[PDB]
Design a protein around this motif. Structure first.
Motif, PDB file in Angstrom:
ATOM      1  N   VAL A   1      65.779  63.606  18.411  1.00 25.81           N
ATOM      2  CA  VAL A   1      66.735  63.409  19.508  1.00 25.81           C
ATOM      3  C   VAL A   1      68.045  62.781  18.998  1.00 25.81           C
ATOM      4  CG1 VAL A   1      67.182  62.114  21.696  1.00 25.81           C
ATOM      5  CG2 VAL A   1      64.928  63.214  21.370  1.00 25.81           C
ATOM      6  N   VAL A   2      67.930  61.837  18.059  1.00 24.25           N
ATOM      7  CA  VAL A   2      69.106  61.170  17.494  1.00 24.25           C
ATOM      8  C   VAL A   2      69.817  62.108  16.530  1.00 24.25           C
ATOM      9  CG1 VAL A   2      69.886  59.348  15.931  1.00 24.25           C
ATOM     10  CG2 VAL A   2      68.227  58.770  17.699  1.00 24.25           C
ATOM     11  N   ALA A   3      69.025  62.875  15.764  1.00 22.99           N
ATOM     12  CA  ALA A   3      69.562  63.802  14.755  1.00 22.99           C
ATOM     13  C   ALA A   3      70.374  64.930  15.385  1.00 22.99           C
ATOM     14  CB  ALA A   3      68.456  64.365  13.926  1.00 22.99           C
ATOM     15  N   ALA A   4      70.210  65.128  16.690  1.00 20.13           N
ATOM     16  CA  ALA A   4      70.923  66.182  17.392  1.00 20.13           C
ATOM     17  C   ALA A   4      72.445  65.879  17.550  1.00 20.13           C
ATOM     18  CB  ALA A   4      70.286  66.437  18.752  1.00 20.13           C
ATOM     19  N   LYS A   5      72.808  64.583  17.471  1.00 19.01           N
ATOM     20  CA  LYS A   5      74.191  64.114  17.735  1.00 19.01           C
ATOM     21  C   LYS A   5      74.620  63.043  16.711  1.00 19.01           C
ATOM     22  CE  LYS A   5      71.980  61.225  21.371  1.00 19.01           C
ATOM     23  NZ  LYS A   5      72.238  59.962  22.188  1.00 19.01           N
ATOM     24  N   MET A   6      74.504  63.370  15.422  1.00 24.09           N
ATOM     25  CA  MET A   6      74.631  62.380  14.322  1.00 24.09           C
ATOM     26  C   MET A   6      75.923  61.562  14.401  1.00 24.09           C
ATOM     27  SD  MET A   6      72.268  62.299  11.653  1.00 24.09           S
ATOM     28  CE  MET A   6      70.825  63.238  11.143  1.00 24.09           C
ATOM     29  N   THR A   7      77.033  62.248  14.639  1.00 22.47           N
ATOM     30  CA  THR A   7      78.331  61.617  14.614  1.00 22.47           C
ATOM     31  C   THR A   7      78.508  60.642  15.795  1.00 22.47           C
ATOM     32  OG1 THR A   7      79.525  63.273  13.297  1.00 22.47           O
ATOM     33  CG2 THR A   7      80.840  62.003  14.901  1.00 22.47           C
TER      34      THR A   7
END
Ligand code: HEM
Length: 150
Positions: free
Chosen positions: A15-21
């Motif tokens: 879930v976090v890796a989907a929106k790294m920036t």
């Protein structure tokens, strides 16, 4: 490290890796706000008014790069940290960070934050919080044992 603990860290981490920036920026600005001393390690970032940092190119890029290395750590994660590919990731940190004398406390403070920002993306329970701490503890224990040479 459990078999249920490994799978929980993977499922929630996606879930976090989907929106790294977007996660990286949030991570760095909590971190410098809550622990402003750690700014001294990043001279270029103090030279800039605080409310301007979120929208700075080197600052978004650096946030992303911290989390993308964490990403690789989660991918090589197995039960009892049994896969040597995990040690690889954090031996790579050892050789990148050894040149500064960043002390252990500074890494602990960042773990606090990273772990908090994951919470704001997905609701963790107590057992999953606990497992996220053992993850970063182990990563940090590996990194530092390697720096003990240099
Ligand atoms: C979760 C733990 C950490 C990870 C995964 C991580 C990862 C990284 C990465 C990927 C780079 C980029 C190297 C490159 O661009 O070739 C880097 C550089 C750097 N790291 Fe970290 N880091 C961590 C903790 C810390 C901490 C706690 C500090 C001290 C506050 C720190 C200080 C620095 C500095 C000053 C640089 C150079 C920045 C630059 O030249 O743009 N790191 N680290």
């Amino acid at each position: 490290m459990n078999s249920e603990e490994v799978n929980d860290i993977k499922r929630t981490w996606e879930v976090v890796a989907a929106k790294m920036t977007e996660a990286g920026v949030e991570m760095l600005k909590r971190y410098f706000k809550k622990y402003p001393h750690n700014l001294n390690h990043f001279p270029w970032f103090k030279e800039i008014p605080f409310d301007d940092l979120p929208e700075n190119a080197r600052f978004k890029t650096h946030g992303t790069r911290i989390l993308r290395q964490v990403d690789e750590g989660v991918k090589a994660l197995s039960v009892d940290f049994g896969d040597k590919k995990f040690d690889d990731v954090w031996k790579k940190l050892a050789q990148t960070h050894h040149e500064k004398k960043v002390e252990r406390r500074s890494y602990n403070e960042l773990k606090d934050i990273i772990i908090e920002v994951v919470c704001s993306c997905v609701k963790l329970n107590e057992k999953q919080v606990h497992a996220y701490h053992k993850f970063f503890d182990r990563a940090y224990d590996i990194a530092f044992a390697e720096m003990a040479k240099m």
